Amino acid sequence: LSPDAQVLVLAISSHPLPTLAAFLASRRDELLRADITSLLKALELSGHWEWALALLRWAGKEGAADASALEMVVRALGREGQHDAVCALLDETPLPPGSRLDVRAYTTVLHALSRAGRYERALELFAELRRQGVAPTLVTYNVVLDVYGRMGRSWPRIVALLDEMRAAGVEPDGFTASTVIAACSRDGLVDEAVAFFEDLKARGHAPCVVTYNALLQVFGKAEALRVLGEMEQNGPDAVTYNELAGTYARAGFFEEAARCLDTMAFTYNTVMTAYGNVGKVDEALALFDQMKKTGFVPNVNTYNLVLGMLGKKSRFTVMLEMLGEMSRSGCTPNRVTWNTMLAVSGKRGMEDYVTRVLEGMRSSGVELSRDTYNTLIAAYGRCGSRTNAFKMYNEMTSAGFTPCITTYNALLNVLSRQGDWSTAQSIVSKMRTKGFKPNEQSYSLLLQCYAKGGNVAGIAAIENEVYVFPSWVILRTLVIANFKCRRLDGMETAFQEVKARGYNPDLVIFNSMLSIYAKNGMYSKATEVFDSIKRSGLSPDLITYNSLMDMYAKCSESWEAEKILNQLKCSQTMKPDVVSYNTVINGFCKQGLVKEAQRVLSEMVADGMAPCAVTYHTLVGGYSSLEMFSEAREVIGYMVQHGLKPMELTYRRVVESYCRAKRFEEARGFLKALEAYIEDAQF
Amino acid sequence: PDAQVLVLAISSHPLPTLAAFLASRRDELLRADITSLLKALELSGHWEWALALLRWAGKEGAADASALEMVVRALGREGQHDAVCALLDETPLPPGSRLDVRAYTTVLHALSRAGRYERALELFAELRRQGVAPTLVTYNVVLDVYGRMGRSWPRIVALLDEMRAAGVEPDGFTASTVIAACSRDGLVDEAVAFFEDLKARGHAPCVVTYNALLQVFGKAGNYTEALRVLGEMEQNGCQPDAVTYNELAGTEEAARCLDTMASPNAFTYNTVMTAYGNVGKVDEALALFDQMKKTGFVPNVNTYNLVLGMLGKKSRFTVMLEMLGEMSRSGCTPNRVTWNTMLAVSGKRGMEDYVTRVLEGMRSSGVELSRDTYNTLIAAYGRCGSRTNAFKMYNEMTSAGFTPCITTYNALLNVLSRQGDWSTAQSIVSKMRTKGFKPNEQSYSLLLQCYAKGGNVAGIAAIENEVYGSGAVFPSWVILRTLVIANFKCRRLDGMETAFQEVKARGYNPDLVIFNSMLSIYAKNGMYSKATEVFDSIKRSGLSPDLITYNSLMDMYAKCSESWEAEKILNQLKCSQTMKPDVVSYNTVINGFCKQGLVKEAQRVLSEMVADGMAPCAVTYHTLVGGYSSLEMFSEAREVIGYMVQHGLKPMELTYRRVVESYCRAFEEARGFLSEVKALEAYIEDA
RNA sequence: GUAUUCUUUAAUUAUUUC
RNA sequence: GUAUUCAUUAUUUC
């Protein structure tokens, strides 16, 4: 409008937001003389809804904001969807005393509070709304009914409002019906929901899709029998389908739905999906058969769906069967099919399956692409068939395809399992000359080959090159990788770096840290950790609790470890673990305290737990220590007398202790290379 | 002697070259106790090396069965099943060789773990063709093989006889395997008879045994018989472990499960509660929880937090709050875990008031807030989008004497990311900088998203330049992901191709979000060539095209003025059997005609749309008018209007704007049309 | 301005608007 | 070496 005002507006929309108020002040008099409403509008067209906001708040604090000013911002805020801002204009009103608003605007604020769970404020506002003589509209009504619906237990107030609205001649719509039914749905008002819809009929009213889904939902968590039926034939399965997907989980039946559906594709596929995503594939395959059994001829896309849900259950045998019915019915498998048959969540016996998929994948033409081979490598990688992954890697290249980074990472996954790093290094080095530079994943997979290789070299060699941006994964992978190698420098090093970069560490790191102190020479940072893990608000684990006991055990303070064990007995959620029992027994044994140690073994059994090899092994050590070899020999009996099968270390610890005690023929009688240990000892 | 020195050589050598290295010190090897070298190489965990030598020696003819058996024990002990199936397949033994049973059974199990059953049976046949006597574990492995093939019950009954006829007595491993086999075929009756018959032999069953007998009933059948087993279980005195309740959980139904185990402890109750939780059936666990009380045992804070956590993931606010009150009313006073659990809730509607209602309890609970608690509260208020309250929580943090961390600044930017309020987002990151803090990646993602919802393209590019060069921010899948999106929302084609470039270059494997966006952006221009290449490349990737992929394709053809091809897909989606055309699908098709004309065709589509049920929207009609509004025709676009309010759908701003502009440019016959009923009637004035 | 399940470490003010 | 459901080639081995 005004050239002076256009300059002012441009000057406002260009100014940063944090400084703007100190700026608007400087132009106080300049602003007051103008039409803010016109500035707000101009600041809204230009796409700067947040600058008008600032202006409004400024003017309210000055007295130059009117209803129309506010009403303009609000309409902008709701179309833009900034409920928070709406709610704040209401909590810090830029309005002068009198001040009444347009209906549309009040209903936008009501929706904003609703959107925030401030149902109690919405109702306060609604009351204030009609005591100022504002005629609410259909949308205002529907918004308020929604407030009542999510606030809960407000059915009577809903009856009241429906009355009030009709008595003022505002007939309900579809947003009114669904809103209401979902309200009954959230309160278990099954009975009164139906009487409602069936009253909607009376007064006239065309039924709907969203309606039925709401009604559906009622009987859902609440009947889906004679009900869900109507919804169909009444008239289209859109969202209504999903409702079936959770209908099954909150209940339990396979006969009614078969008996129902019988009586009657997507619709079919929907119900099948409902079964296979909650883990009822046996239930879906039956739905599939029934479906086939009645005319219906599935296409490749229906098979890919069934195979897809069978796949998450690793039902190899029937996936191949389905693969059969396809190709022998015309339904030629597509790319999506093989990818589906190869994206199986790994189980035991996956290799031969994969092998059979590949056999039909190549006995049916289908030229394997580059990505196809990568998919086939990943598959044998899941199983762990290094042998078959690499045969695929070799067949690949030998056919002229060029391996990508996805192909190298695949192979790298494998070796990682087996901690074969000497082969990993070769992969990496190969990929570099080919031009391919390792990514983050490629590194984590290296860190894991090394750790299972006990190669600290390659570990610290990467630590260097990273300290390779250190991502939360890499730093977390490094903390672990060092713990397998039990490396305190490395672990600690990158521990604080995880904090200095604004990452929140999980119980894994904390647990891993606590123990690299317990079994080491630090026993206070440990206490720091168990105080940090808590101060952090995290819930300690048994493993955490067990690692804890090991600390006290190594600090020669065992009863305290016994306390934590006992305290676990009440935990009501924790519940010891022979490890916890073992760990405590190991400590007492380590301090010469062995009666106390078998006293906890007695509890152990009494509690109905189950002593094991390692458990007995501990005592034999602690007995051998203070040379009292008879009570020790009595133990190994117990193990075997109960068939617990001792360990050569159980024997060694006695042999080596029988040697040092000047008793040689004893070491001999009692009793491989061990006897040899006595010979090189005796003389 | 001289061996200890030679082992270290092989133990310290590049694996992919060890062959030619064993070829080197060959004659020192042939005179060395191979099996001896093997035993040594394993004593240091160098088992990959003991294999390579085996294969070497084998190729030289220097490996005997005693050696192979030695490598196999380790592999099995080191869990290397594929490697053993390899030895089976290549054969490093000379002709006429026979192996220990312990080894043979280690291979059988290895063949079993790869699904190579038909092969395991053939090896078993050989093993007993060499007059080797199988042991218990051998018989048991083979049983496990029979049980995973299917239709193998007679072979199980027959082998049971043999093994029992060789004086070999079944065990718990046997029982669980035979029962579990019957569970994998639906052999309910025989599993029972077998159990009955096995019991009657004096065999005391056990947990594992009872667990398989229960999977029978529960897998595909009944919850009443499986529950009965649960019955007979305790009656025997065998305590159901965690795996027990998992079977039931996966097998008014919660009222039953509690009636049986009634004729337990607090840990028991939690074990079954958590079972139903981890399955996804939580209303049941609640039901038990109602009983654990009205039955005696009183739950503590650990038990309650457990329950709250379950509710958390379902974000069942009101009940969570009820439960927090019953806690503090029945005596159970919350802890730092209780609160944190309460604020770790899943985003949703009305979450802001919940958090306020929780914080209201943290405060009254006279519990000093810590630096951590603030970070949580800021995060939750930031997660629901209560920008206002996050910042209030923020200033309250930095005023009680706590120091923000990066998470603290990240929470805050998360909110702004939803609002697009990048100006503040900037002002923050700098503050993060002026405090000795360096922005994370997510910090860069948030800021990125923050610029997107706004429209600030200069801050995006300012991120790309700092990402495509310096190391301040590494091109992480995430960061490149947040870029394809933030450039779409701002329609920066150039800046997406670069990202789709690097993604398909930095070793990444794009996702449907990325593909589709690329498809819609190319389609939003005439970019047919690339777009179709993207679509197929979705196919060549191995992903399933959703509706948005199909709608974007139709709009491309629309855009390319081939709207007939657009309907072929709508038809194709009509019989997709898996994908049902969407409202936006139909419109996209109609507009494509109306954009090039043939509105009588546009009517053709609308017709069936209604024929397929399908209830049209405003846009549906606003588009139909477009063609009828600007096609030397007005008597129709007026008749079409009477289908909106007369059908209570209510037109809109883009609509009428097409009526005046199109009519006031096709005059007077336009004036009377607009008179039939603000911001517009200045266009007419402008004309 | 409003409704029916998933979505809340979010493509869901995602793709259609002569 | 072998079995039951769906950081673990995790924490205890005088």
Tab-separated table of N, CA and C in Angstrom, chain A residues 393 402-405 408 424-438:
chain	number	residue	atom	x	y	z
A	393	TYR	N	30.929	-63.765	-5.239
A	393	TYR	CA	31.794	-62.651	-5.527
A	393	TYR	C	32.672	-62.956	-6.717
A	402	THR	N	31.075	-55.135	-12.117
A	402	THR	CA	32.010	-54.453	-11.302
A	402	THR	C	31.459	-54.321	-9.931
A	403	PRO	N	32.101	-54.948	-8.977
A	403	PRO	CA	31.716	-54.836	-7.580
A	403	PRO	C	31.667	-53.400	-7.149
A	404	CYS	N	30.671	-53.079	-6.339
A	404	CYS	CA	30.541	-51.757	-5.782
A	404	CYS	C	30.874	-51.808	-4.321
A	405	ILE	N	30.705	-50.689	-3.644
A	405	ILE	CA	30.991	-50.616	-2.232
A	405	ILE	C	30.035	-51.498	-1.465
A	408	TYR	N	31.536	-55.038	-1.409
A	408	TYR	CA	32.696	-55.214	-0.567
A	408	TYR	C	32.306	-55.226	0.884
A	424	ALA	N	40.201	-59.267	5.589
A	424	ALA	CA	39.487	-58.011	5.527
A	424	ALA	C	40.377	-56.926	4.966
A	425	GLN	N	41.557	-56.788	5.545
A	425	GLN	CA	42.559	-55.845	5.084
A	425	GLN	C	42.791	-55.961	3.602
A	426	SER	N	42.710	-57.167	3.093
A	426	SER	CA	42.944	-57.377	1.691
A	426	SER	C	41.781	-56.854	0.894
A	427	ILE	N	40.593	-56.951	1.464
A	427	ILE	CA	39.388	-56.506	0.791
A	427	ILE	C	39.453	-55.007	0.650
A	428	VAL	N	39.654	-54.347	1.777
A	428	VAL	CA	39.785	-52.908	1.849
A	428	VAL	C	40.823	-52.368	0.886
A	429	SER	N	42.033	-52.912	0.977
A	429	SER	CA	43.128	-52.492	0.112
A	429	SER	C	42.770	-52.675	-1.359
A	430	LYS	N	41.958	-53.689	-1.643
A	430	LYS	CA	41.541	-53.972	-3.002
A	430	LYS	C	40.547	-52.936	-3.451
A	431	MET	N	39.732	-52.490	-2.517
A	431	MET	CA	38.677	-51.587	-2.873
A	431	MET	C	39.200	-50.189	-3.127
A	432	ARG	N	40.305	-49.870	-2.461
A	432	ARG	CA	40.927	-48.555	-2.586
A	432	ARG	C	41.534	-48.323	-3.967
A	433	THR	N	42.145	-49.357	-4.538
A	433	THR	CA	42.816	-49.213	-5.814
A	433	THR	C	41.798	-49.259	-6.896
A	434	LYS	N	40.703	-49.931	-6.626
A	434	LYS	CA	39.623	-49.964	-7.579
A	434	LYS	C	38.991	-48.591	-7.627
A	435	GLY	N	39.252	-47.786	-6.610
A	435	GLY	CA	38.768	-46.424	-6.576
A	435	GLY	C	37.815	-46.193	-5.438
A	436	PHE	N	37.321	-47.288	-4.877
A	436	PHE	CA	36.296	-47.220	-3.853
A	436	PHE	C	36.887	-46.925	-2.506
A	437	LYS	N	36.402	-45.865	-1.885
A	437	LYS	CA	36.850	-45.500	-0.566
A	437	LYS	C	35.835	-45.972	0.436
A	438	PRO	N	36.295	-46.734	1.421
A	438	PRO	CA	35.532	-47.215	2.564
A	438	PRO	C	34.694	-46.144	3.215
